[PDB]
Amino acid sequence: YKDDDDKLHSQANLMRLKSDLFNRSPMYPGPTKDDPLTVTLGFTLQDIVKADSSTNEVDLVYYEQQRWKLNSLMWDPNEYGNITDFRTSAADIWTPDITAYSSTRPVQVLSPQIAVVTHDGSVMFIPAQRLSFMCDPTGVDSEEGATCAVKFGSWVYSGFEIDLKTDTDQVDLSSYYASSKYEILSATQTRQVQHYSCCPEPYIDVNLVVKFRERR
Amino acid sequence: DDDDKLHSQANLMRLKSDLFNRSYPGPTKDDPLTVTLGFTLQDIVKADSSTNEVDLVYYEQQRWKLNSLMWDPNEYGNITDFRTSAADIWTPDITAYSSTRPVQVLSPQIAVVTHDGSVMFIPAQRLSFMCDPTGVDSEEGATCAVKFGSWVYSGFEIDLKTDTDQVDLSSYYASSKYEILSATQTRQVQHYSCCPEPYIDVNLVVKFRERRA
Amino acid sequence: DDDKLHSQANLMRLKSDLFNRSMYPGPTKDDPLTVTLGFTLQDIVKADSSTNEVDLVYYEQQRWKLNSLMWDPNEYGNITDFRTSAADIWTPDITAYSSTRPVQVLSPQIAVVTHDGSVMFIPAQRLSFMCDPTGVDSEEGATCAVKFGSWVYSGFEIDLKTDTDQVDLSSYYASSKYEILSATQTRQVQHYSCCPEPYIDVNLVVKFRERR
Amino acid sequence: DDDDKLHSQANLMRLKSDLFNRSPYPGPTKDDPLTVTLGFTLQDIVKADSSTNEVDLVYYEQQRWKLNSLMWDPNEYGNITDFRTSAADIWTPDITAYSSTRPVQVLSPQIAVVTHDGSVMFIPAQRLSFMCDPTGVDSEEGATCAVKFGSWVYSGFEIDLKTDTDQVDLSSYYASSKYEILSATQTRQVQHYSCCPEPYIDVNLVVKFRERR
Amino acid sequence: DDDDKLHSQANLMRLKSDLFNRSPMYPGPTKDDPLTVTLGFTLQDIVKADSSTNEVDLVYYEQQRWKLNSLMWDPNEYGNITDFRTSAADIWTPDITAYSSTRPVQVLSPQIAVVTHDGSVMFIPAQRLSFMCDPTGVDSEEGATCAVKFGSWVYSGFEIDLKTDTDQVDLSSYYASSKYEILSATQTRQVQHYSCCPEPYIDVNLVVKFRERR
Numbered sequence A: 001y002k003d004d005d006d007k008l009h010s011q012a013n014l015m016r017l018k019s020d021l022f023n024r025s026p027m028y029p030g031p032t033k034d035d036p037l038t039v040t041l042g043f044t045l046q047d048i049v050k051a052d053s054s055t056n057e058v059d060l061v062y063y064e065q066q067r068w069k070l071n072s073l074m075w076d077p078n079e080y081g082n083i084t085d086f087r088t089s090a091a092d093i094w095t096p097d098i099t100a101y102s103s104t105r106p107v108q109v110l111s112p113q114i115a116v117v118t119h120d121g122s123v124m125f126i127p128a129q130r131l132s133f134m135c136d137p138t139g140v141d142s143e144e145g146a147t148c149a150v151k152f153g154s155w156v157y158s159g160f161e162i163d164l165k166t167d168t169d170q171v172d173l174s175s176y177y178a179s180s181k182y183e184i185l186s187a188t189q190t191r192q193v194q195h196y197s198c199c200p201e202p203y204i205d206v207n208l209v210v211k212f213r214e215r216r
Numbered sequence B: 001d002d003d004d005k006l007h008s009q010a011n012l013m014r015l016k017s018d019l020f021n022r023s024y025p026g027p028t029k030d031d032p033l034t035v036t037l038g039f040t041l042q043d044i045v046k047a048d049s050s051t052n053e054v055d056l057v058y059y060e061q062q063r064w065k066l067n068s069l070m071w072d073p074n075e076y077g078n079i080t081d082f083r084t085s086a087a088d089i090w091t092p093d094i095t096a097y098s099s100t101r102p103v104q105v106l107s108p109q110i111a112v113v114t115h116d117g118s119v120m121f122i123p124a125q126r127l128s129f130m131c132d133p134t135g136v137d138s139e140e141g142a143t144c145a146v147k148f149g150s151w152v153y154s155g156f157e158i159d160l161k162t163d164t165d166q167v168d169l170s171s172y173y174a175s176s177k178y179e180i181l182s183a184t185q186t187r188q189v190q191h192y193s194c195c196p197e198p199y200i201d202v203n204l205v206v207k208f209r210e211r212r213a
Numbered sequence C: 001d002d003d004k005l006h007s008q009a010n011l012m013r014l015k016s017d018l019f020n021r022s023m024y025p026g027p028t029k030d031d032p033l034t035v036t037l038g039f040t041l042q043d044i045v046k047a048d049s050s051t052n053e054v055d056l057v058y059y060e061q062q063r064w065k066l067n068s069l070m071w072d073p074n075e076y077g078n079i080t081d082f083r084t085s086a087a088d089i090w091t092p093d094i095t096a097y098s099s100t101r102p103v104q105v106l107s108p109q110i111a112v113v114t115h116d117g118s119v120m121f122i123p124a125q126r127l128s129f130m131c132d133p134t135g136v137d138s139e140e141g142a143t144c145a146v147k148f149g150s151w152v153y154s155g156f157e158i159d160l161k162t163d164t165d166q167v168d169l170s171s172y173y174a175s176s177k178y179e180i181l182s183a184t185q186t187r188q189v190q191h192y193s194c195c196p197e198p199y200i201d202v203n204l205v206v207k208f209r210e211r212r
Numbered sequence D: 001d002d003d004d005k006l007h008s009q010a011n012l013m014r015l016k017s018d019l020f021n022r023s024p025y026p027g028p029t030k031d032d033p034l035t036v037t038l039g040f041t042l043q044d045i046v047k048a049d050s051s052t053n054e055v056d057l058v059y060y061e062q063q064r065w066k067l068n069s070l071m072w073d074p075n076e077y078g079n080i081t082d083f084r085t086s087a088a089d090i091w092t093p094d095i096t097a098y099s100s101t102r103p104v105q106v107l108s109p110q111i112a113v114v115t116h117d118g119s120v121m122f123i124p125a126q127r128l129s130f131m132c133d134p135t136g137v138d139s140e141e142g143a144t145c146a147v148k149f150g151s152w153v154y155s156g157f158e159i160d161l162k163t164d165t166d167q168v169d170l171s172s173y174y175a176s177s178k179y180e181i182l183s184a185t186q187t188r189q190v191q192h193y194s195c196c197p198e199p200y201i202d203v204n205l206v207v208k209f210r211e212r213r
Numbered sequence E: 001d002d003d004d005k006l007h008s009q010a011n012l013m014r015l016k017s018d019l020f021n022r023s024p025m026y027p028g029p030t031k032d033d034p035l036t037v038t039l040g041f042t043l044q045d046i047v048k049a050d051s052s053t054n055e056v057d058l059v060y061y062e063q064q065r066w067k068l069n070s071l072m073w074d075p076n077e078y079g080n081i082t083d084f085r086t087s088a089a090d091i092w093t094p095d096i097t098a099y100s101s102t103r104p105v106q107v108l109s110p111q112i113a114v115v116t117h118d119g120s121v122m123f124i125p126a127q128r129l130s131f132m133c134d135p136t137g138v139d140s141e142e143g144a145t146c147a148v149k150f151g152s153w154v155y156s157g158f159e160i161d162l163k164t165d166t167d168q169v170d171l172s173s174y175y176a177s178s179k180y181e182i183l184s185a186t187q188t189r190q191v192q193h194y195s196c197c198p199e200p201y202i203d204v205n206l207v208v209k210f211r212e213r214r
């Protein structure tokens, strides 16, 4: 009857929308010098799980929020029964190649590979990860604690193709595990522009810097 | 008698065909879905006090209902349900919110679909999650908690419920290193600052201690 | 050289006729199946008394029979059986009920199909399961048990049977850290109050101790 | 110049096409048996665990066989005598360690060399954990361990095995390994079991080793 | 300038289409169509040295470069595109392997490559590698020395030649706070002939001298 149809319709609209987007001019070839893209990064640090002073590797668990905007993902909500956003497999759309620059093990993914696309063409994608990176935990057992840092950025695109930005320099600590072995003294996330004599193009990274110590 | 079997097979293959490779984009605000969760806690395998991670093995029972998976048993030679690869159908993205390692899957990825459109899927998992086992060697024991919920859908798209707050303990390993004092599973609604959309999770809370002498 | 090209053609035709033409959806209440299980225990590799997990390595022999896999050897140049990738045919979802890590596969995923419709498939596996090794260092030794059965089919869909209650120990590693006192494999039938179907498993029970 | 390269490319792609289509090999049979030649090049005994009695080896396993269905006349394909191809593109034998304790790990690309006469050569580098008591490793006499390699599903009526030599190649053994090799042999064995009327073949790899001084 | 962007996208998708179809799949190099791969290492960190198994763990970037005629295009025909990024699975890549690894290589970076209009490809996987190495002496002033050959697994030097732009491993990204400090790191092209075989074999030999940080 009445209510069952309205659900069948909204389903048809969504499937039509997804079809119109993923087939009509197929998956986007990535950014270029002529069509650059800005990716916004933010970290929500959940836990420093482990600090290994025999190999100088530290393990973090965090959510990496990524946001970007494509014209080719735009639609008029009016043409698709008032749909303003949708969930889709990350495999269905282009995603940026943001990588830790000093990891020592492949990143492990803790959350579904699904993204949210909005009618204005913005995508949001928020992978939870466990990362092992190069870090000397020396001083972790003192009042001053240890300090570690890891750069995140595109692996293959320069700043002429992908720019990075953060909404804030403060890493979100409001979900930090209250009973972690390590307590967080501060955690910052900072856009850096790197330059190199050989090369006209700039390189961009977000520098994640964590100061931590053993819980008392 | 060999024919009756060939027929029931044909009906099942036709049904599966009519459902999958002829006819789901997931739930929406306009077409929301309710997932029922239940845990059967098999074993606390390991409690690592140097990293504060605990390892659990459990069965996660998931249940939901799709109109698009309905059929009339009469049209398909009285078939009322069938077994199918979980890869063949949409499944919910229920995730542990505080895991520290990817979940490991211990059982086949197979689901049961019923003529009324309900699906049941029951993955066995091993999970490492954030937990301070301090006190696990005392009479009071330790307490740990982990939220499970959709990763990408708010409570306008996916609602969660439990049939019961008591975690099923009747398959708990009698000789585990740890004994279970209590295990509850509770639907929580977090509201927020800004936002109008409520978020739903199921909070798994386990009280446990070292098994005695 | 022709004799060989012919027998090849016949085999490829047979496989074609069976797989790419005529479609097995698994067993049902109306078309139930019997799987025969047997274990050959190769080694107890490791017993961890800090987590109560034991690691076994064994061969799990699985056998079943499908009408849809039958052929007349006469129509296919006297072929009576063939080897095929396990990915090419339906296989049962036999699982350990108390494993603590995903099972690791030690052998090729290949099965043997016979003209009468029977399949035999014998994965070698390493399994970690829930087990208290307490007493392993005593004359009496430890005892551990693990049920194996279908994960999603009740006994109305898949019955289980064993040819024998004795686990095959004739390939047990003579120099394992642990010696086997006994190892049995037993069909069990179970009801639960949720459901009206019988449920069926094969219970593998191993008694072992530290090698002297 | 540039054309003679485009041509040799076209010839190779045509050859590969002509082979992997036009009669797309079902494996050996009683009527069409096959001989696989095995050889090991032992690179390193990495680890010897006396608490679980497992030893880790790294070696190259050379495999060689010959299929009529892989033959071609070099004259018909611009004088191509051999080519490199993904192992996934052709049938390969199911040679397994009979007493491994972990899945084999593959250290090298899964690529094989096919020659106009129909012969294939495939040389996977592997790390293997297998059952072995390292007792005595720390004495002048050292330890001895053994592992059989053979087909998992084919009897000796379908696959015969042979070695070109009984001596395992030791010329790439890591000079600074924790363990030095006293001897390493590879031997064809023919077995009979009473389950069965057909013979079974393996190559038994026997290693005698001790701690480096 | 919404149209400009749609056009440059169309051009790129057309180019990628024209390349990955029409004469589909380059079949790899041959005696008649040999290829030169250029290797370079950027050593990031010696992570671990295990003296109980004689395995050392390295983390490095392996730069690989080669050139295919079949990847060439005229930038003029494709709206002035001079290069593009593509999934490494979309194109042939060389089978460069460590000859004395003890565990499968672990990949730390996206499997993406850069193709340029002149037909050259660049691909720079970050890896963690465990290889056979006796760290004896690491705790002395002289330190330890280890070596690992890298080369094609299945192609002789008649099919794949290797070369380096420089003998010096790039150390400018070496982790300042690694447990181990680098005394020197060289990367050297070697040519081998054998008795088994009239073909020449080429490998690049990575040699690292290192010791415990003080």
Ligand SMILES: COc1ccc2c3c1O[C@H]1C[C@@H](O)C=C[C@@]31CCN(C)C2
Pocket: A126, A175, B149, B150, B151, B152, B190, B191, B198, B199, B200
């Ligand atoms: C209670 O509402 C939520 C339910 C799930 C999640 C979040 C919620 O609120 C967001 C902000 C913060 O509370 C933490 C995680 C959130 C963003 C990341 N998602 C994927 C997980």
Ligand SMILES: COc1ccc2c3c1O[C@H]1C[C@@H](O)C=C[C@@]31CCN(C)C2
Pocket: B059, B122, B171, C149, C150, C151, C152, C190, C192, C199, C200, C201
């Ligand atoms: C012995 O029969 C069963 C075989 C497998 C399973 C169950 C069985 O009985 C059910 C009730 C209880 O025994 C535990 C698990 C069950 C429900 C969860 N499934 C998915 C796993």
Ligand SMILES: COc1ccc2c3c1O[C@H]1C[C@@H](O)C=C[C@@]31CCN(C)C2
Pocket: C040, C059, C061, C122, D098, D150, D151, D152, D193, D195, D196, D200
């Ligand atoms: C049922 O027990 C077995 C499980 C696996 C294998 C064999 C078994 O019995 C042996 C004799 C015969 O049955 C065939 C193969 C065997 C010998 C070769 N091995 C490697 C494969």
Ligand SMILES: COc1ccc2c3c1O[C@H]1C[C@@H](O)C=C[C@@]31CCN(C)C2
Pocket: D041, D060, D062, D123, E099, E151, E152, E153, E194, E196, E197, E201
């Ligand atoms: C049979 O032993 C081998 C196993 C693998 C390889 C080679 C062998 O012998 C060497 C010389 C020649 O035969 C060809 C390649 C070798 C050198 C290059 N390596 C990396 C591949």
